[PDB]
Amino acid sequence: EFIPHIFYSLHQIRKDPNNLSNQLETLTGSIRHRLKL
């Protein structure tokens, strides 16, 4: 399953941009992983 994970990661992006760049980069990498699969 990639659809709910994409949704959720999308929402903690749009909820907390104030996270340090580390979390943003890691989470974007996670979304790139899910759409790659």
Binding site: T28, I31, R32, L35
Partner: peptide
Amino acid sequence: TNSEDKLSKVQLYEDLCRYEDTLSKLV
């Protein structure tokens, strides 16, 4: 060879395509 032509004919293929493009722009 006609398989990919049939796949490109249905809209949701284009949908996944520009969804990938939009995430590429976002990243």
